[PDB]
Amino acid sequence: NKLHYTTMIMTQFPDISIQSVESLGEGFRNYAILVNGDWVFRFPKSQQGADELNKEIQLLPLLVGCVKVNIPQYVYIGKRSDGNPFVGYRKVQGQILGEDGMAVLPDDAKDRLALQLAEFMNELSAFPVETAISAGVPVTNLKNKILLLSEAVEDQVFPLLDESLRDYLTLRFQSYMTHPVYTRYTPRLIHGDLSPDHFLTNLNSRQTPLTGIIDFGDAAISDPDYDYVYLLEDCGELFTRQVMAYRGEVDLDTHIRKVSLFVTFDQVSYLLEGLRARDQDWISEGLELLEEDKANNFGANS
Numbered sequence: 670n671k672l673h674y675t676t677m678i679m680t681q682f683p684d685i686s687i688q689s690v691e692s693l694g695e696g697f698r699n700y701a702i703l704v705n706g707d708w709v710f711r712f713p714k715s716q717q718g719a720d721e722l723n724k725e726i727q728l729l730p731l732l733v734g735c736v737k738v739n740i741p742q743y744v745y746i747g748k749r750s751d752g753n754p755f756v757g758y759r760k761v762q763g764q765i766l767g768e769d770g771m772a773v774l775p776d777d778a779k780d781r782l783a784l785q786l787a788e789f790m791n792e793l794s795a796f797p798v799e800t801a802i803s804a805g806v807p808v809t810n811l812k813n814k815i816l817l818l819s820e821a822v823e824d825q826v827f828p829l830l831d832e833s834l835r836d837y838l839t840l841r842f843q844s845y846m847t848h849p850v851y852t853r854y855t856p857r858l859i860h861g862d863l864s865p866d867h868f869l870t871n872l873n874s875r876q877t878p879l880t881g882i883i884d885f886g887d888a889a890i891s892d893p894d895y896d897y898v899y900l901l902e903d904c905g906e907l908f909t910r911q912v913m914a915y916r917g918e919v920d921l922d923t924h925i926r927k928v929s930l931f932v933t934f935d936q937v938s939y940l941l942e943g944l945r946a947r948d949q950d951w952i953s954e955g956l957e958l959l960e961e962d963k964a965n966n967f968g969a970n971s
């Protein structure tokens with residue numbers, strides 16, 4: 670409730686003179702409003718959102734000096750009656766790119782974006798892991814996570830699928846588990862939600878089309894390749910290869926094959942969560958995404 674949000678801001682930060690309040694955006698974890706056209710106030714929607722925010726509160730101050738683009742800097746830190754936090758930060762300027770917006774960038778700008786994104790990812794990968802861990806960033810046991818997923822999928826998802834889709838999923842999980850090249854990695858800090866719905870851009874700039882990056886709630890210590898997952902899903906294979914090349918990846922084919930598997934796993938994880946929530950529209954969406962994934966990977970099987 671936007672009126673209730675305004676009330677908490679006024680009570681806890683009475684010196685903010687509120688002239689305007691509007692809805693700005695919403696995800697699965699947070700509701701965001703814009704105050705005075707300048708300040709984003711972001712309120713967790715769930716205990717999980719609050720736990721992710723507590724991590725961001727500790728991590729983001731450590732990142733600012735290490736990352737070139739702008740990121741949220743929490744200047745106001747509030748508390749709700751249940752004890753969980755909410756935050757206010759100066760709006761990260763620019764227009765949200767979005768999946769739909771990525772397609773139409775002039776190639777010069779696309780290339781500039783690929784370079785900036787490559788540089789951002791390199792700085793995350795360079796951040797000391799123990800420093801992140803001491804700031805409460807969780808360590809993802811990626812191999813065990815995928816093992817557990819494969820089991821939950823066979824049990825809970827397979828009964829909804831036709832035989833061709835079940836065989837496809839069996840093949841994909843087996844591919845990741847069978848080839849040691851895919852499962853050996855040095856753990857690194859990743860953003861964890863690196864998609865164009867979090868890319869703030871200024872299409873009227875040449876050297877720096879990427880203005881900033883938001884939503885660090887999924888930051889984790891994991892396989893750094895996992896940070897390509899939304900680039901491949903939303904921005905496409907060519908773009909992803911361009912970012913990889915700028916980061917100095919010598920084996921593009923192998924790493925694209927690997928990220929593609931992560932994309933499959935993310936899609937089935939999404940469906941599984943929808944299923945557990947008995948959310949019918951979410952399940953329908955998840956099934957469509959799965960069908961699309963299989964079609965996108967025709968021939969990858971052989």
Ligand SMILES: Nc1nc2c(ncn2[C@@H]2O[C@H](COP(=O)(O)OP(=O)(O)O)[C@@H](O)[C@H]2O)c(=O)[nH]1
Pocket residue numbers: 693694695696697698699700701709711759760761762763764765866867869883884885886
């Ligand atoms: N333009 C702009 N939009 C923002 C900013 N912060 C949040 N938003 C919008 O609010 C939405 C929800 O914020 P987010 O941190 O992604 O929430 P979550 O996905 O639920 O964790 C985002 O997807 C953006 O659409 C900002 O600094 N600038």
Ligand SMILES: [Mg+2]
Pocket residue numbers: 696862867884
């Ligand atoms: Mg988000």
Ligand SMILES: [Mg+2]
Pocket residue numbers: 717721887
């Ligand atoms: Mg989480």
Ligand SMILES: [Mg+2]
Pocket residue numbers: 696698699862884885886887
């Ligand atoms: Mg988030």
Ligand SMILES: [Mg+2]
Pocket residue numbers: 924
């Ligand atoms: Mg590698």
